[PDB]
């Protein structure tokens, strides 16, 4: 048989890699109060996600 047993357990920086993010998606349709359409860009002056 032939196996692999890489080990770094003398520190926590290794053990910290696996749970790094595990985060889901939360960019959603930023509907605008003009046309209710697939919002395109956020206005840098009003910070509103306008589409049209």
């Amino acid at each position: 048989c032939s196996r692999t047993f890489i080990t770094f357990s003398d520190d926590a920086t290794f053990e910290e890699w696996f749970p790094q993010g595990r985060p889901p998606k939360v960019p959603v349709r930023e509907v605008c109060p003009v046309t209710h359409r697939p919002a395109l860009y956020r206005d840098p002056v009003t910070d509103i996600p306008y589409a049209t």
Partner: peptide, 27 residues
């Protein structure tokens, strides 16, 4: 269509305006 015209070139040489100062956190 966007060739800079001499009229607009002369007009732009005027007093400018300051940029906006946005701070909205609402709808």
């Amino acid at each position: 269509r966007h060739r800079l015209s001499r009229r607009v070139l002369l007009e732009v040489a005027t007093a400018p305006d300051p940029p906006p100062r946005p701070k909205p956190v609402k709808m």
